[PDB]
Amino acid sequence: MAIIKEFMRFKVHMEGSVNGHEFEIEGEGEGRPYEGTQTAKLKVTKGGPLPFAWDILSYQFSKAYVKHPADIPDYLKLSFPEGFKWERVMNFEDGGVVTVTQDSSLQDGEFIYKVKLHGTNFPSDGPVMQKKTMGGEASSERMYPEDGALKGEIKVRLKLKDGGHYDAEVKTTYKAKKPVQLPGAYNANYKLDITSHNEDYTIVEQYERCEGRHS
Q1: What 3-state DSSP class applies to 196?
Q2: When you count CB atoms within 10 A of the terminal residue's CB, does the N or C end of the chain come out lower?
Q3: CA–CA distance, 28 with 9 (Å, rounded to integer)
């Protein structure tokens, strides 16, 4: 029950399964919501070491930290303290599919994120199950208002270890819990890096920069 400060922390809990392998991850993050920068330290609390690529999870660990020009209303910052929810489908090039449902709220002056993820139909020999990805390229999410919510579309490209890319079409709906001002169409430009990780990815740190701009 508060405003969005120049510096904000968040806690995240994720529960999910990928190709039937169940896991849980808890994390803590911090950043500067108006500067569009944030970092997070994630720990696998159940089902470690993960038998699949960390890169499919990385995108699921924070839209309140997007730098917006003053002529683009900040729909998702304005949803607080109640918060917002988002649901996403990631359609990978080799048939694999990830869906994500997320709830974002503010408690004791910190954001709380609860994430549920399902991953299925990934080929056993593919880059996800064989841990052959090496991070993601910078990308631009096309943001647009639709049916009283905000939608986003991203063509995500995961770097392949032996050179090349492995892609996914990403579609997400973001909706405030209570109606607040929706913006017009714009682009959210992202850069996300895995800053560090232990050998088996049970401890991982990420950084993301995101800035909204007109096309």
Answers
A1: strand
A2: C
A3: 7
The DSSP output letter for 65 is S
Backbone angles phi, psi at 55, to 5 degrees: -50, -30
Per the document, the length of the chain is 215
Asked if 16 contacts 116 with a C-beta cutoff of 8 angstroms, the reply is yes
Reduce the DSSP state of residue 55 to 3 states and report it: helix
Span between the terminal Cα atoms of the chain, in Å: 34
Please list, in sequence order, all residues whose beta carbon lies within 8 angstroms of the beta carbon of residue 118, skipping any fewer than 6 positions away: 16, 17, 18, 98, 99, 100
Is residue 117 a contact partner of residue 105, using CB atoms and an 8 Å limit? no
Token pair for residue 80?
A: 């607080």
Q: Which domains does the chain have, with CATH numbers?
A: 1-215 (2.40.155.10)
Question: What are the two backbone dihedrals, phi and then psi, of residue 166, each rounded to the nearest 5 degrees?
Answer: -130, 120
Q: How far apart are CA 205 and CA 196, in angstroms?
A: 5
